[PDB]
Amino acid sequence: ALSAQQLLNASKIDDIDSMMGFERYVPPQYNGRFDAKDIDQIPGRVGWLTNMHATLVSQENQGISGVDFYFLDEEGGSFKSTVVYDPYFFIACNDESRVNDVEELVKKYLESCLKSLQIIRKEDLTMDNHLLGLQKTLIKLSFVNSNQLFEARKLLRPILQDNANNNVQRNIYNVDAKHLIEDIREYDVPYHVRVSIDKDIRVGKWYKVTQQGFIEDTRKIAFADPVVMAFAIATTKPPLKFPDSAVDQIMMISYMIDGEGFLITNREIISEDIEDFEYTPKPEYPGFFTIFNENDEVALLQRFFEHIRDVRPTVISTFNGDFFDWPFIHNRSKIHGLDMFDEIGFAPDAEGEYKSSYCSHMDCFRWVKRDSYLPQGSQGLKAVTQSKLGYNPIELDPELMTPYAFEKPQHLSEYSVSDAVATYYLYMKYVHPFIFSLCTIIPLNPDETLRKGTGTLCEMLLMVQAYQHNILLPNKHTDPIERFYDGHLLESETYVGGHVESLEAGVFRSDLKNEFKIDPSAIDELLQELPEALKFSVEVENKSSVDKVTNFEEIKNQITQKLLELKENNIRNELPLIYHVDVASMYPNIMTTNRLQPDSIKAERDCTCARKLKWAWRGEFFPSKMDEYNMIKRALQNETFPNKNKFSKKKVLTFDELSYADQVIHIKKRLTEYSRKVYHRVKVSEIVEREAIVCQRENPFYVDTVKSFRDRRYEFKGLAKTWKGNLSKIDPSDKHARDEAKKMIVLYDSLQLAHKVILVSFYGYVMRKGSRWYSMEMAGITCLTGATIIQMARALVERVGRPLELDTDGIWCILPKSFPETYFFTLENGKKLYLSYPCSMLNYRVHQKFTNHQYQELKDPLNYIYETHSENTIFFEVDGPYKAMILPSSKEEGKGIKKRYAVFNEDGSLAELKGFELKRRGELQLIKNFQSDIFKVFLEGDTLEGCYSAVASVCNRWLDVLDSHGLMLEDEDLVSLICENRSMSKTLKEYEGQKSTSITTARRLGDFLGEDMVKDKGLQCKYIISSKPFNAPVTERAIPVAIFSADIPIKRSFLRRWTLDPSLEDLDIRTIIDWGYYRERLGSAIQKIITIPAALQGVSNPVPRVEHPDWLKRKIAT
DNA sequence: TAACCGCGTTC
DNA sequence: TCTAGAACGCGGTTA
Ligand SMILES: O=c1ccn([C@@H]2O[C@H](COP(=O)(O)OP(=O)(O)OP(=O)(O)O)[C@@H](O)[C@H]2O)c(=O)[nH]1
Ligand SMILES: [Ca+2]
Ligand SMILES: [Ca+2]
């Protein structure tokens, strides 16, 4: 009977919408049609589609499912329109010769909730002979609304459950319509996604609502201009503690409406009225802020709600507003007897996010986490503003925010508006164009397009294609509760992913010679391949004819000469070329090249239409054999287990009464212990080579969806490379032009990077839980192929140069300056073709060794005729040459360090900085600052020994800081440097049984500040390591730095018990710090970045105060 | 020592 | 309910 609540919400939403200018519009009647050819003559209204929501409508007894669509018109007004559409799923049969039987069974069995029945045909990619036109026969079950559809699923669950079970026991001497139901299908499609897909409607497009439906107005090009408001709030706060919406009250609310700034103040907390002021952190971001000082907090909550009602925003944007700002304003509204939904139409949703019917809530944080590609350390509003808006916003320590309401109130106003300027323009520059454009192709509304996982976005895109090609959707994948290998229970199953190598360490610089030993057979091969490789660079890499180039031979001769010189002088000590090569969209292009897609992976049971590809399976299993497993369970059955507290009338249940999941949880725990006793090992690992069949004839709907999105991405990655090149030839004097070029660059890279995460997710999606297109084989094939390609490239670079570091699809290397480099073909059109020889020599080899010659495509669909061709879309790309590269080395002999290095441009600026602490969220501030100081110094010096000598100067300076027990440092700089901040992904309660510095810090912080400091997840534990108790585990000597900001009685009490020293009177933070700990951690960074690499390049220890690992001293001593 | 865990990276 | 993947570094505990 839940329809009541739903039908109620519909009326509430209807009146809220009408208050905000969204009245239900019904188009005039029209007999005939010009069928979208002359829309101007069909009566109705034109609007820009800005939102959509599933609703329930009435006849105008049960509700009628429909979708509301919210439009902005061309006359400055708004309106909504409603489409009704019967929900439906399918029933499949195990014998299509009796489909009519099931029809009469379900017609009567589901008669309580069924509206209509119908037999339809779709294409099943899991059905034999489906490539010849055979189709699966199905019964389409339609309903008046989604509640009825659900009742049908409930009534149908037994039939499917019993049929999977065996038959009952009647006349054992004897030797049906229910068992004809094999499965239900397409039952879990969100209703509004279903309407968007079946009706081809998309938010962000222009339509004309007519009686015969929405007609797309392909003439309108640009988006409408929705009213857009972004807001932030500031609240009071107990010292060292978190805001409490039950106690703490809202001090101010700053916001921005279409570029106008406003600030509301609670004068009961703000010491004085605020005057209108301007914060324009850069000319591109204006900000004139009008003030609304109000008497009490309630007055502030009521002006905000009224201002919102007046301006009518169809977009409201925040930064983490879903889990801080909105629930604060909501609780403060409740306390003061105010109802947020009746005032502004906003309320929490089933996930606790704050949503509205007429207005999308665009929480910019969600874009940052999903689409920005920023490291976690740079995902705060400050770091984002620096990266994406190009300026430093106002920063105020939060402990100073409550008092500065009284002492320095205008300052606290400026910070408040600073967060509002940054949020508004972050939205309009980055989030608004991306999300509203993405809605034009993905069938979600703006709120869901912003928030859903990128694997789900992929699934949305894939479902559109499958529907439009009349392909029946597979049900969501479900992996089994137990898997077995060679009789062992498996703990983990996966494939071998990317191939990573650390090959050299140390400093490499464009002005410092290096020794190269060049393989003469390599130059022989390159010389043999050269005429065709250059023909490949022209014809394939540049889509042009060799007949229209006019300097082919001159380039062939010039390249050949340098090659022949390298073959005669194999040994050389020259200046290096620090180059990088990476395959563009490697896994997508491997997939599209090999025509990889989950429906294409066949067993011997079905199906040269077949291309065999190899992958590497890796399993992790217990060493226990099934004999031991069966024993462990039986024991568990004889034991007794507690019960869920429904009633607690029965307070014990047997093992076999536990859910199958909870059963194996106990089996798993018990089995780990048995293996540790009888085997002394818990998990065993094994890799197996596997070969899968990839049909090259399968319906390529998945492969083609990937191609489309890759090409969609390539647009922006190419505009990015264009505008980057423009900025190369803008006169340094022309500031405005250079500023505009850079702005274009940062936008297009952001757009290409946001498309990147969806693109790569088309690969991850085949391994995602709940995937409608799951295939481990396809993922494992993708990876092994990529490992084979990059290792082929490494083999060649090895023989003509020195590869430095290698990761999945990319190689950093140095090559002799004398190696053939960059050339420019010339055409009769006067145009030039770029050529980088090191890129093309690889690409000609990739296309020689990894092209799919068995690619097949339907040429004549009516007669089912296929035409085979060759396909290869895999290409390395080149960037460089660079001024410097710095690769660290491990403290452990023979090992490398992967995924960490610094790279510098010729202009001296940082090109890349991968992996290091400096960039990761948290870590120990000292190591962060030391790293930031050291990397630029590697460019100084005139020789390899002087470069290291210069860096060494910075080290010994940093060492003096800690050898002096922090005496050379003021207190402010001391707390910052020696602190370490770590994050707790869950709450402390869920870490029970584990020891960590974050765990210890959380516990101590809870005892001192109360339990309410642990209640939530994501807690930031800021600690220092104390000297005492001496020789104790570091996890036991971890003090939260908040104690040092507490009252002396508190400080001594906790510091005494934390150090196990009840005589402690001396609370100076300097005396508590375990300086030998930090001295060793700083020293450990120094070895890996400076001293041990220097040794590997034959340079005596530049920092003698950091002693070499014993193994190195021995090797040094030969 | 080697296995193993939580976090946050590079792909 | 909703949910892209594997390989790796590093401080830290534990067999
Ligand atoms: O977030 C990510 C990044 C990378 N990857 C995986 O790493 C592979 C190589 O990582 P890359 O960063 O090189 O990505 P890419 O080749 O797809 O894109 P561009 O170089 O053109 O910028 C990708 O093909 C993908 O499979 C992910 O799965 N997820
Ligand atoms: Ca790249
Ligand atoms: Ca790549």
Side-chain angles (χ1 to χ4, degrees), chain A residues 1-34 36 39-58 60 62-103 105-106 109-150 152-153 155-156 158-160 163-165 171-177 179-248 250-274 276-309 311-405 407 409-527 529-542 544 546-547 549-601 603 607-624 626 628-632 635-643 645 648 652-667 671-672 674-676 678-720 722-728 730-741 744-830 832-848 850-858 860-866 868-956 958-969 971 974-988 990-1010 1012-1056 1058-1064 1066-1067 1069-1118:
Chain A
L2 171 88
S3 295
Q5 173 99 65
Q6 314 209 301
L7 306 142
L8 181 61
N9 293 326
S11 201
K12 280 191 306 141
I13 302 273
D14 283 345
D15 290 317
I16 275 287
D17 283 339
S18 319
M19 168 191 307
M20 306 287 301
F22 282 106
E23 82 290 12
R24 179 108 72 211
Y25 165 69
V26 179
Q29 276 101 323
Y30 172 82
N31 329 314
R33 209 171 193 190
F34 296 160
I39 165 177
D40 305 314
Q41 323 302 340
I42 314 197
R45 218 170 155 187
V46 199
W48 184 71
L49 189 46
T50 206
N51 213 340
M52 68 196 180
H53 297 287
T55 191
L56 265 186
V57 279
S58 77
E60 295 174 357
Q62 270 299 52
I64 290 117
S65 280
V67 181
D68 285 342
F69 295 91
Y70 296 66
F71 303 85
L72 316 174
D73 68 39
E74 338 186 8
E75 294 175 352
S78 57
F79 76 87
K80 69 187 212 162
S81 271
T82 303
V83 174
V84 300
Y85 187 55
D86 298 339
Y88 68 87
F89 57 100
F90 304 102
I91 286 192
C93 295
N94 32 69
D95 169 23
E96 274 145 80
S97 85
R98 257 157 98 205
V99 48
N100 319 89
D101 290 33
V102 201
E103 247 199 309
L105 165 76
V106 302
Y109 185 66
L110 280 173
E111 209 188 88
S112 52
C113 49
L114 185 59
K115 157 163 202 244
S116 151
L117 220 62
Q118 185 180 23
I119 282 151
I120 59 81
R121 278 140 294 257
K122 268 181 153 79
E123 186 179 355
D124 189 348
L125 302 205
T126 84
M127 186 192 241
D128 301 7
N129 308 329
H130 76 265
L131 287 198
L132 284 320
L134 248 176
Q135 291 186 304
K136 167 153 280 284
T137 287
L138 305 138
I139 314 167
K140 170 153 141 179
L141 285 58
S142 318
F143 300 82
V144 169
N145 59 52
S146 280
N147 316 107
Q148 303 274 28
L149 185 145
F150 199 73
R153 314 193 21 201
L155 305 189
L156 272 196
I159 291 69
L160 307 152
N163 295 354
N165 289 26
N171 187 338
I172 74 164
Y173 297 139
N174 181 7
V175 125
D176 213 55
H179 319 328
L180 278 170
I181 302 173
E182 101 177 344
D183 202 346
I184 65 183
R185 302 290 297 265
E186 287 189 41
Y187 58 89
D188 53 26
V189 183
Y191 171 69
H192 72 298
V193 164
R194 181 88 264 171
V195 180
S196 199
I197 292 177
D198 295 18
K199 302 285 113 178
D200 203 31
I201 314 173
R202 299 285 189 283
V203 173
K205 284 158 165 307
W206 288 85
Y207 293 99
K208 190 179 183 173
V209 180
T210 79
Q211 160 171 48
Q212 286 315 339
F214 298 0
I215 314 160
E216 209 190 332
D217 192 340
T218 66
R219 319 171 279 182
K220 317 269 303 190
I221 64 141
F223 290 164
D225 288 309
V227 176
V228 171
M229 172 204 312
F231 84 80
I233 73 163
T235 89
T236 72
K237 175 164 98 43
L240 296 175
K241 254 282 194 155
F242 290 132
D244 200 321
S245 33
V247 198
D248 286 288
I250 298 183
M251 309 180 350
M252 23 176 50
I253 296 184
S254 61
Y255 52 101
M256 199 133 185
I257 306 189
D258 283 346
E260 322 285 56
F262 304 93
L263 178 50
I264 325 169
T265 84
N266 190 22
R267 282 291 333 255
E268 287 200 9
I269 300 266
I270 306 301
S271 32
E272 50 174 300
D273 280 343
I274 285 289
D276 292 11
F277 66 119
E278 171 197 0
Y279 175 52
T280 297
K282 259 232 187 194
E284 50 260 46
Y285 319 129
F288 300 117
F289 271 83
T290 293
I291 315 295
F292 283 118
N293 307 285
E294 311 287 283
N295 308 337
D296 50 346
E297 168 176 51
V298 175
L300 163 146
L301 279 179
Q302 295 182 341
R303 179 138 252 83
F304 187 49
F305 294 149
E306 194 200 336
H307 204 169
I308 287 164
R309 284 191 307 261
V311 300
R312 289 166 160 189
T314 65
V315 166
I316 276 185
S317 173
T318 66
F319 203 96
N320 206 37
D322 258 337
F323 289 106
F324 173 75
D325 308 56
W326 280 114
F328 210 100
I329 300 133
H330 191 218
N331 213 46
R332 295 324 280 173
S333 295
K334 284 193 268 195
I335 284 269
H336 298 307
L338 279 172
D339 173 86
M340 208 193 231
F341 191 117
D342 276 285
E343 300 252 315
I344 51 142
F346 276 82
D349 78 342
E351 285 165 280
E353 277 148 22
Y354 277 67
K355 308 286 166 45
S356 155
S357 70
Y358 64 96
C359 181
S360 314
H361 171 215
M362 293 292 95
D363 185 348
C364 292
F365 190 39
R366 295 303 285 281
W367 177 83
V368 181
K369 324 152 92 151
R370 192 190 70 187
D371 313 310
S372 86
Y373 264 100
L374 280 170
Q376 297 246 70
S378 309
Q379 286 189 24
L381 177 40
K382 169 206 127 273
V384 167
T385 305
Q386 288 167 326
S387 170
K388 289 314 160 175
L389 298 203
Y391 76 79
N392 302 312
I394 301 331
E395 33 196 322
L396 199 93
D397 172 63
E399 296 295 314
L400 261 51
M401 295 194 60
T402 320
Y404 274 52
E407 322 185 342
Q410 233 276 335
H411 188 168
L412 163 86
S413 297
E414 301 187 26
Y415 173 103
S416 149
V417 304
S418 171
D419 284 14
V421 196
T423 305
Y424 175 79
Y425 286 110
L426 187 61
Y427 177 72
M428 301 288 314
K429 256 205 153 293
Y430 294 96
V431 183
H432 188 80
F434 176 54
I435 302 285
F436 271 96
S437 310
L438 204 49
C439 279
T440 64
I441 63 159
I442 291 186
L444 298 159
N445 77 336
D447 284 320
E448 310 174 295
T449 306
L450 179 67
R451 297 176 165 85
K452 293 262 173 187
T454 60
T456 290
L457 298 180
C458 290
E459 181 178 296
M460 290 310 98
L461 288 174
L462 288 159
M463 266 151 67
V464 165
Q465 295 309 127
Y467 176 82
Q468 298 191 337
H469 292 92
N470 199 50
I471 299 155
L472 182 62
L473 261 53
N475 285 325
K476 297 185 178 233
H477 166 98
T478 48
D479 47 341
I481 311 88
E482 278 171 303
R483 292 216 63 110
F484 289 96
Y485 175 73
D486 262 38
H488 310 282
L489 188 55
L490 270 169
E491 334 183 38
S492 104
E493 229 190 353
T494 188
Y495 50 88
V496 179
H499 183 74
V500 201
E501 280 174 23
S502 188
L503 295 143
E504 285 206 23
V507 191
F508 297 79
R509 252 164 55 174
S510 59
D511 68 322
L512 271 45
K513 273 147 125 187
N514 282 98
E515 287 148 21
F516 302 90
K517 190 166 334 183
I518 287 176
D519 184 345
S521 37
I523 306 296
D524 287 358
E525 291 157 358
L526 295 179
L527 279 187
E529 292 150 22
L530 183 59
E532 298 270 55
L534 297 176
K535 186 194 167 202
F536 167 92
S537 155
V538 178
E539 276 186 9
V540 168
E541 274 181 359
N542 275 286
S544 60
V546 280
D547 314 334
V549 306
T550 59
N551 59 346
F552 197 81
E553 299 289 341
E554 191 180 347
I555 281 136
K556 178 156 59 134
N557 298 339
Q558 284 170 311
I559 289 171
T560 317
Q561 167 90 31
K562 311 195 71 172
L563 283 173
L564 278 161
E565 206 271 354
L566 292 169
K567 190 208 160 151
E568 275 268 281
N569 307 10
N570 321 339
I571 290 98
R572 35 180 75 231
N573 173 92
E574 329 189 336
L575 289 186
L577 298 189
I578 310 167
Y579 267 118
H580 183 241
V581 295
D582 119 274
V583 186
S585 311
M586 172 180 235
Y587 286 21
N589 276 306
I590 288 174
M591 276 160 98
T592 63
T593 276
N594 288 265
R595 213 185 195 273
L596 289 177
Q597 58 169 34
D599 290 284
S600 286
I601 307 305
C607 271
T608 75
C609 74
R611 159 180 206 81
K612 301 158 307 142
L613 297 184
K614 273 167 213 180
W615 63 295
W617 176 86
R618 196 180 59 238
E620 288 179 353
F621 47 95
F622 306 84
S624 338
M626 264 288 217
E628 304 89 271
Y629 166 95
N630 297 124
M631 179 187 351
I632 277 270
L636 276 34
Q637 316 193 273
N638 282 289
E639 283 143 86
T640 206
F641 290 83
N643 163 229
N645 310 71
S648 308
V652 296
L653 280 195
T654 51
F655 175 77
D656 287 296
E657 300 177 76
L658 311 174
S659 81
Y660 182 33
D662 282 357
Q663 286 190 27
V664 316
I665 270 66
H666 293 98
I667 303 194
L671 217 51
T672 59
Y674 173 73
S675 322
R676 174 164 294 126
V678 193
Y679 301 88
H680 322 311
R681 185 177 33 182
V682 153
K683 150 196 318 162
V684 192
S685 202
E686 179 167 349
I687 298 174
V688 180
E689 294 259 309
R690 301 224 197 153
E691 206 173 53
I693 308 79
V694 189
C695 210
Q696 306 295 299
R697 269 170 172 212
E698 189 54 89
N699 195 312
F701 85 105
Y702 197 116
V703 168
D704 292 354
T705 311
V706 173
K707 276 160 190 235
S708 184
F709 211 87
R710 160 179 62 76
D711 298 349
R712 174 180 313 266
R713 181 210 183 214
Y714 275 3
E715 270 302 300
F716 306 110
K717 197 174 136 107
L719 294 180
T722 284
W723 273 104
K724 274 186 227 225
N726 304 348
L727 184 63
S728 316
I730 319 292
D731 200 345
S733 150
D734 203 345
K735 184 190 185 184
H736 188 67
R738 301 203 100 240
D739 287 348
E740 299 301 289
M744 276 318 113
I745 285 160
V746 179
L747 153 79
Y748 280 134
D749 259 331
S750 304
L751 279 176
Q752 74 93 350
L753 272 177
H755 283 84
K756 198 198 151 138
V757 70
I758 302 179
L759 193 48
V760 296
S761 300
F762 281 113
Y763 150 74
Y765 182 84
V766 313
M767 286 282 294
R768 163 195 194 266
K769 297 157 209 342
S771 176
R772 296 182 181 284
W773 290 285
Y774 179 107
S775 186
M776 208 198 256
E777 288 83 356
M778 201 220 66
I781 292 170
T782 308
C783 286
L784 186 55
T785 302
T788 314
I789 292 156
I790 198 55
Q791 278 168 255
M792 177 273 308
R794 200 224 42 239
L796 189 37
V797 169
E798 251 171 356
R799 306 168 58 212
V800 294
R802 282 158 80 186
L804 302 185
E805 198 264 11
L806 173 153
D807 197 332
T808 306
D809 73 321
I811 296 161
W812 288 90
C813 61
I814 48 139
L815 309 154
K817 183 178 179 180
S818 33
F819 195 86
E821 234 192 286
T822 45
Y823 300 81
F824 274 81
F825 287 118
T826 67
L827 303 141
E828 314 164 357
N829 289 337
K832 310 181 134 325
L833 258 43
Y834 175 86
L835 155 76
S836 170
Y837 184 60
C839 211
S840 289
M841 75 193 197
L842 300 167
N843 283 343
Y844 177 80
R845 287 214 166 167
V846 177
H847 280 247
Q848 265 305 90
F850 297 89
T851 280
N852 177 8
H853 299 281
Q854 329 164 259
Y855 202 100
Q856 289 198 38
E857 206 103 59
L858 248 194
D860 182 358
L862 292 159
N863 298 307
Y864 302 102
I865 282 144
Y866 288 91
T868 306
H869 65 251
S870 279
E871 194 90 52
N872 197 320
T873 191
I874 309 160
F875 295 90
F876 283 95
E877 281 188 344
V878 154
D879 50 295
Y882 292 96
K883 192 174 168 98
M885 195 192 202
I886 296 113
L887 291 90
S889 207
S890 52
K891 318 197 313 172
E892 142 177 329
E893 174 168 28
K895 194 197 162 225
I897 283 194
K898 303 153 157 165
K899 306 204 184 268
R900 314 217 153 165
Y901 49 80
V903 179
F904 288 89
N905 304 302
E906 193 46 51
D907 55 19
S909 67
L910 194 55
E912 323 283 335
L913 185 69
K914 314 272 171 197
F916 285 111
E917 286 71 25
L918 175 54
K919 156 191 276 186
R920 307 182 26 116
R921 170 169 69 191
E923 311 291 320
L924 159 66
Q925 202 56 66
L926 163 88
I927 300 289
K928 279 165 107 61
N929 292 35
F930 163 81
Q931 267 170 2
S932 102
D933 277 21
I934 215 80
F935 283 128
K936 41 143 93 183
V937 191
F938 276 104
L939 294 157
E940 292 170 1
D942 321 274
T943 59
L944 192 59
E945 264 258 15
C947 143
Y948 274 122
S949 310
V951 160
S953 308
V954 176
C955 301
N956 296 316
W958 276 103
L959 284 165
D960 287 333
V961 182
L962 294 303
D963 280 340
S964 99
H965 278 237
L967 278 182
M968 331 166 78
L969 273 179
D971 272 37
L974 176 84
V975 47
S976 323
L977 260 174
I978 312 295
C979 181
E980 168 134 11
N981 193 330
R982 312 241 263 171
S983 281
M984 268 205 330
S985 67
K986 320 173 302 209
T987 71
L988 182 75
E990 335 182 42
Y991 291 94
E992 253 174 62
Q994 284 176 330
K995 324 166 141 267
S996 64
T997 60
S998 316
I999 277 157
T1000 286
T1001 313
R1003 228 191 275 303
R1004 308 202 161 149
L1005 199 66
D1007 306 327
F1008 152 49
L1009 289 192
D1012 296 341
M1013 292 274 319
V1014 166
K1015 77 190 145 172
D1016 301 342
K1017 57 170 173 149
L1019 173 70
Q1020 285 207 330
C1021 320
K1022 324 223 208 194
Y1023 61 90
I1024 59 108
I1025 287 322
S1026 66
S1027 301
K1028 299 192 49 172
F1030 287 139
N1031 291 118
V1034 198
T1035 48
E1036 292 276 20
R1037 305 177 288 113
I1039 297 158
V1041 299
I1043 210 55
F1044 294 134
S1045 279
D1047 319 317
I1048 310 304
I1050 330 301
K1051 274 169 83 143
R1052 196 175 19 246
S1053 189
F1054 285 102
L1055 282 170
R1056 278 183 163 163
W1058 288 338
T1059 54
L1060 277 54
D1061 181 3
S1063 94
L1064 182 76
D1066 208 348
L1067 321 175
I1069 307 103
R1070 327 178 144 279
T1071 38
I1072 317 302
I1073 281 141
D1074 177 352
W1075 291 98
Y1077 171 72
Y1078 297 96
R1079 166 69 174 80
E1080 209 270 321
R1081 293 205 61 200
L1082 173 45
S1084 205
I1086 297 207
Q1087 320 183 11
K1088 290 189 289 208
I1089 286 157
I1090 299 113
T1091 73
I1092 282 149
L1096 267 150
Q1097 296 179 305
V1099 169
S1100 287
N1101 193 347
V1103 170
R1105 310 157 60 176
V1106 175
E1107 203 105 337
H1108 269 171
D1110 289 345
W1111 61 266
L1112 193 42
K1113 302 148 123 166
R1114 309 195 322 242
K1115 158 152 178 252
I1116 275 159
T1118 324

